[PDB]
Amino acid sequence: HKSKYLREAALEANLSHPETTPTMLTCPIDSGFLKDPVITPEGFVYNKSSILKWLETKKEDPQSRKPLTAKDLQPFPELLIIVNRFVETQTNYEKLKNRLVQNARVAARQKEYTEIPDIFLCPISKTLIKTPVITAQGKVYDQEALSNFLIATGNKDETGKKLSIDDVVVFDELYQQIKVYNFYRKRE
Amino acid sequence: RTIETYIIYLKEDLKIADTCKTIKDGLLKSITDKTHFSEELATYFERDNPNAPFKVNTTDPTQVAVLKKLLNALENAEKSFRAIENIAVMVSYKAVHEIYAALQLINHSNSDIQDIVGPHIQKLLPQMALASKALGNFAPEHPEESAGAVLAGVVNMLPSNLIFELPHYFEELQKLIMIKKANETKYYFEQLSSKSGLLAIPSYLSIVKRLIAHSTDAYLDAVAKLEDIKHNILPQLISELEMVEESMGLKPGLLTDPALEQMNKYYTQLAEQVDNIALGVLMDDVFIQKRRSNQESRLNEARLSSEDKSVLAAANRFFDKIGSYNSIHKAWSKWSLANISQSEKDALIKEYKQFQPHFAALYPDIDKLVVDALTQPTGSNIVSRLYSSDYKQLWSSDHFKQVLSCKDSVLSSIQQSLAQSEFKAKLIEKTMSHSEETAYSMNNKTTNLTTRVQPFEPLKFTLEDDKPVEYYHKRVIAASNQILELERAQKGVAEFFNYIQKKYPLDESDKEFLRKAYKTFQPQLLALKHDDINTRLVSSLTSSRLTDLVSLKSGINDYLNEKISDLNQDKTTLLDKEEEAREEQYAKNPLVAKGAELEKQTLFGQMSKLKLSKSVDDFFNKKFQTYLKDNLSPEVWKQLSSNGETLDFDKIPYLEFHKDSPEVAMYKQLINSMHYMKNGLEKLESLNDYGDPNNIYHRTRFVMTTFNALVMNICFSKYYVMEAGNNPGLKAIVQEGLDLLKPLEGMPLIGDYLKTPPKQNIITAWKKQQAVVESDQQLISEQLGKIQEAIDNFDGDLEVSDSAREKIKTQIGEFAKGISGLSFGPGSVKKILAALTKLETQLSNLDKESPEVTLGKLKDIHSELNAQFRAAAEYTEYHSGQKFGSYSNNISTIVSNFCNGLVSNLPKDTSYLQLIAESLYQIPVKLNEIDANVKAFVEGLNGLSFGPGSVKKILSTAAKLQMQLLKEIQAEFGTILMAAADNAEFHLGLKPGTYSRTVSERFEKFYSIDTTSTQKRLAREMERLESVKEDTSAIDTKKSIFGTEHEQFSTLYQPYASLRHLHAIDRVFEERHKINKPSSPFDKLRDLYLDGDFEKEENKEQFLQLYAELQPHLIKINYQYDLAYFLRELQTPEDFKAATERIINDESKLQELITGLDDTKRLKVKLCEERIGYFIDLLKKQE
Amino acid sequence: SKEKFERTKPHVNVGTIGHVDHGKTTLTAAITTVLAKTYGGAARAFDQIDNAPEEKARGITINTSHVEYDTPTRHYAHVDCPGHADYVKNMITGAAQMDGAILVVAATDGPMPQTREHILLGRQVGVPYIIVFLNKCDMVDDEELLELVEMEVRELLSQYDFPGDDTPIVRGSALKALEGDAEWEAKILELAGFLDSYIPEPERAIDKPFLLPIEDVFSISGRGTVVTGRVERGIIKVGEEVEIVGIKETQKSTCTGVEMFRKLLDEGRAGENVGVLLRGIKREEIERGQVLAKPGTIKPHTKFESEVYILSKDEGGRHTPFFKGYRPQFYFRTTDVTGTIELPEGVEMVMPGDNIKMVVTLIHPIAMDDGLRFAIREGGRTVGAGVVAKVLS
RNA sequence: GCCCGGAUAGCUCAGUCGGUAGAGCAGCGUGUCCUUGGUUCGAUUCCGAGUCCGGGCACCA
Ligand SMILES: Nc1nc2c(ncn2[C@@H]2O[C@H](COP(=O)(O)OP(=O)(O)OP(=O)(O)O)[C@@H](O)[C@H]2O)c(=O)[nH]1
Ligand SMILES: [Mg+2]
């Protein structure tokens, strides 16, 4: 079950947006990233620094509730090897996020634009973005302009990738940047 | 002649120039103290030369500007008054009203400036009022224009809690550390919660109650209460104290360092006690963070208010648009702002809505003019608006000219407000620096780390579509505070890496600086994925490689730069949205006049809104006169009330006071004082009520004279009220009236306002007054000046600071004042001048001898000079006809104080009652707190006489009590108290029994057969009636004023007086002494007037002697027959003739006085008969 | 000029006073046009009154304008005065030629600062009767407001010794009357009737030595110089000798012609607004304020003792006291002179609202007599009102 | 009558952010600046009025 746990954690992280950190990847006891995880005979993710406090009150499994001791609950770094890549992917994802916002901030203060800035233009709508939504790979569309497009061509897009509404969530920072741009243009 | 009298009155009695100089010097020394005020405020008052006026720029704070204006007004007033003394009416008027203009500036200032200025400026308010009243005598006579109190002798009554209260409170709570902890808490609550008058921090009661409750007391609840005290209450109190000292302008830590030490001791002892019963540092980590966060919030508000330019731009646009109308355009508009086009009105309204507060504060009437002109519909007629006469006067004027004349003042006010905000920001910056220094010093001069601090999360941006102004303001301030945090973090990392580079180009020695630098930016280093680096640094810095952390320096720097850039962008965006919301909110609200609302708040509007006149009238009509009817005997009440239940209100301002008994005259004076007090309060309230919506209120300097006159009348009447209140039977109601006027002590421009008598020879007094008019003394003044210059010229090894120079100069001035009133005998002046010369030689040679020889020589000089001055003072007392031992003691005290100063600055029945209470308390305690009970007993029974006879009885009873250490001693004490009570009651017009039963009840309450006591008191009353029957004061005074020849002398003196108004006419004048020899002072004065040869000094001395004889009686008829001012005006023989005629024309009033004495005896005998009737009735009923 | 001005009816000097822009000029035009509709008349237009380029540009009256009309039993010379606060002096000069005043008070405004100021100043220069005209009554339909204005004006008149409870008040509209609305022409006719009845014909002094205060001087081309004004007393005939007395040294001249509203007069009588031709005098040798007098009957004076009431701040007077050496401006009938003030013994400062017996010495000698009222103005406001108690020198 | 501008030592003048009048000549200046008020903490200075002086308009019994 040790391999199945990481297998399904990997699929859950992959299907979900990388900015949505899974609640199981982080240790439920301390709500922190995997840095010192432990294992159970069936196989669950915890933290040693948290398991030592948990076992004092209840000498059993936090989730399966089976009677378990501290001797068996040994550090399990096999769950770390995935986490790092995930987080670096997250970091790499974030490595775009800030930039995708930073230039936007500058774009929010430019005056007398010849055309709507590209970061403010939806590629699948060719119009100003009303509410921005960000793909798992790092592209931004409009919420309605993506929903109607997906239902028109059957949850497919661009190169026929399996992308749906539930897997792509609103981009809040870009949304506030759009609000700033609209407020500044409305000043005229 | 009158101008000379005014000049002398200014120079000698009021001493206005000296008062102005003293006030200016004290104010300037206090505000440049550098130990009570900060250096930022002090540097504004540095002058190249002390003869130049302070310059008020547009770049100095509002409070610095008002202080400069006040100091300049004081200097110019002193200059004008000194110029008057160097030689008039116009110059004095101008100086007085310049002082009044400064007073009006104080009136329109805030609480901080008012409390800074009040103690110094309160010293010349009575002087200003008396100067104004003297000036008013140069105007045409206006009877009934004032009709106020007659100011008889007011010239005679010419006159750190914040930093100590909190330390005292926390010391008291340190003292509060089964049943023992059940009354101490209540005692502390009563002692402290009752304290007020300094709660400028508008929460203090909540803090004191919370600390009392929490100090009254598993361990989790106690720890939670301790942390709540350390984090929520105490930091809030410290922050409020810091705001107090920032608005005040004091030095950083003036009144927050002692308080901080006190509460640190308090919290440490609390923590120790809690630990003993079953962390506590008061500056652990988060107290510091909360203090710094409040400081940064205040700093950012100050910086935002300083960097705002919208109000100044709006004012500039408004005045530019108003100034764009030339003569033709203004003529077309008919010089009214209401006749301009509607679009122009809209633009002007948009501009004026942004700077209305400044304009209305400076010009409350032009503000109303502008608002009405811009906003009133043109269809409406002026007549339907019901304008007042002066509002119509302001309305008919050139509106453009009136509005444009306010431009410089309004712009200066706006720029000065911006400068005030910037100055407050600098003050807060120094406050944070000093707070950091104190926090560093208080712990160990060492800092500690912890690997558990929450990371630094930059605030998320959210742009609400439409929210009130305060919402965006809060977001802006949060962004600015976060900017400041990041700025400190970047400064810390810069210093950290600079020290790393300069200390080792991780097992080090000076890890404290690295710890203090890293604690500034630990959250930012933790924000990145650097938890391992942080946890490796903390342990290695608190217990112990540094060559690798230098790598992640550029990353941290660029992260800080990016985040501060983002926060700056976001602050600008939210500021723009704030501007939009402010514009929208301005558009929604209509334009409404604000002048009256600001005028209602200045200083006198606040006092007027209290409506103290209504309460005073309520007490005067409902509680005062009913008590007078209840307690006064009907015989004396018939004099005050013709109807029997209400005072004779048709004649309340009594003016005779010489046809009545002393008790009746005192009651009439008390009624007059209450009436004047009520009238003055009501006039002050009417003149400062701004509740007419159809009227304009012009801000001027010429209303302060009326306000000061009213305040002076009120305070003089209150003075007489407390003077009449020191009677045993009248303490209660007088204290009630005092409690009514309680909210008048504390106001800066009123304050106490007042103080809250030798007998020398008549010729000596006249000569002294003549010398005062015409102004060894020059010799001693030159000697003291030589001493002062010798001290100042001391440039030896013993360096003398300028502060010591000022101290010795002030001591020299005090010594000159003390010795200016002495007469020295033959050769005494030689001895004193030789001693002073030896003293100045020693002072010039202070460094030429050892300190022991110097101190011995100066002590010998002090002894010799003090002995010589005692001899001179005794000689002066003998030659001036005074009483021995009075002036000499004061002269010796002055000399001793002066010598102590120079050596320092060069490197009663109340006691009988107290002992009675002490003995009565010690009687049972020695045969079985005390001080407080004795003090309360003494205070409640203050004002008893005890006579000369009962003193021996009290002493004998105390001796018997001491010998015996049952109720006989108690009975004797009670009957002595009762006899004193009867004496006090008969002195007043009180009904028998009242105060006596009151004091008996008090005595028996403090304590924890009657037939003999009642009989003894009855005998006391019978002998009192006999003694009253034996009185002949009226006959004695009649004989003293004129003997048994007044009628005969009048009959044979009228023809001589008629003949006075030819060669042989003087012949009978020679023979008149052979038939009309005087035998009484009044007849002697008549003969002296008949002589008419006042050129000679012999009959001048004779008149002085006669007036000395007649003064004790003339003073009762009129107050002007004193021995100081009446003699001062006797300079020329014509003045002597005028005074003789004036005294002569009062014979009817002496007759009225003697008849009043007879009526006094007539009333007294009736009082005794009523009293003895009451006691015989009580004695017969009790059986 | 051309006509001869036959004397048939009693002649009354009236004028319009009141606050700025309250309708005095419109009232004068309306009176002229209504009396021309109902009687002979002249029917002057508005632009013929305020005709000066300065007045046309500013829109206000600047100098007094003189018109005439005729009721059935009287002949009126009417002085329209400026109402602006800056031209009060001009008003004063006009107010010196009034045997009666129409105090024009706008119903839409009520009495204003210049209403009170004009009442006081007309009292000081000798206006003995006032008839209030509630103007702009077409713009106010309320009746309570009209009564409020009436009582306020009545109390204002009584404040300055005018019989406020007896003063007639006419509720009209000069703009509508000038337009031609008969209902308001009836009100104008009522005002004319009040002028005829309420104001008595004054008892003129046709026997006293000749006296004429000068209000204006003209340079008639080809003829000479002309001095206009109301003859205070006496009769001035062509060919008689006169002297100019006042600011400068007294001059001598002859009268070579008298006119009255551009009509030749054989002789000017007391109380009549006439114009006199003077032989051989330049226009720069005569100013407003001087006096035409019979030779050797008037001696100008510089120092006089007077009883002066100083106005309070609420009456448009000073708000601060003045001291010795105060130099205000003193306004007598057509004269204004700077003077210095000496206070009585023991007095150093005079408060507003005070009554003083002061000695005033003028910088130029002027023709004045005992019991002559005067005003005291300084800094654009009226600061006091006094009467010459006696003439020192 | 309505504007505009000047008045500072015996003479010619500089003094403008409102902080106690100075450069020359004349023989080391109580010259508060033409005078009077106002505003202002404070006036040669800003506002008003008045006295002289000038140069622009006005009207014409
Ligand atoms: N509605 C109305 N308007 C009037 C009336 N009388 C005068 N006016 C208007 O008020 C304005 C005032 O103009 P004038 O009559 O010349 O005022 P004035 O009394 O001469 O005042 P000054 O010119 O300053 O001397 C004029 O433009 C008229 O149009 C009136 O009775 N009713
Ligand atoms: Mg007009």
Author numbering:
A (entry chain D): 17 to 204
B (entry chain A): 3 to 89, 104 to 175, 189 to 206, 228 to 267, 279 to 339, 382 to 608, 617 to 655, 663 to 874, ...
C (entry chain C): 2 to 394
From the primary publication:
One of these effectors, SidH, 253 kDa in size with no sequence similarity to proteins of known function is toxic when overexpressed in host cells. SidH is regulated by the LP metaeffector LubX which targets SidH for degradation in a temporal manner during LP infection. Interestingly, we found that SidH interacts with bacterial tRNA and EF-Tu as it comes bound to these molecules during the purification.
We performed Gradient Fixation (GraFix) to stabilize the complex of SidH-LubX before plunge freezing the sample in liquid ethane for single particle cryo electron microscopy analysis. 3D Focused classification in Relion helped us get the map of SidH bound to LubX with an overall nominal resolution of 3.1 Å. SidH does not undergo even minor conformational changes upon binding to LubX. Helical bundle 4 (Hb4) of SidH, which lies on the opposite side relative to the binding site of the EF-Tu/tRNA complex, mediates interaction with LubX. This implies that LubX can bind to and ubiquitinate SidH that is complexed with tRNA and EF-Tu. The C-terminal helix of LubX and the connecting helix of LubX which joins the two Ubox domains of LubX, primarily mediate interaction with the Hb4 of SidH. Specific interactions between SidH and LubX include Arg115, Arg119 from the connecting helix of LubX and Arg197 from the C-terminal helix of LubX forming polar interactions with SidH residues Asp684, Asp688, Thr691 and Asp694. SidH and LubX also share a small hydrophobic interface involving residues Val190, Phe193 from the C-terminal helix of LubX and Leu566, the aliphatic part of Lys695 from SidH Hb4.
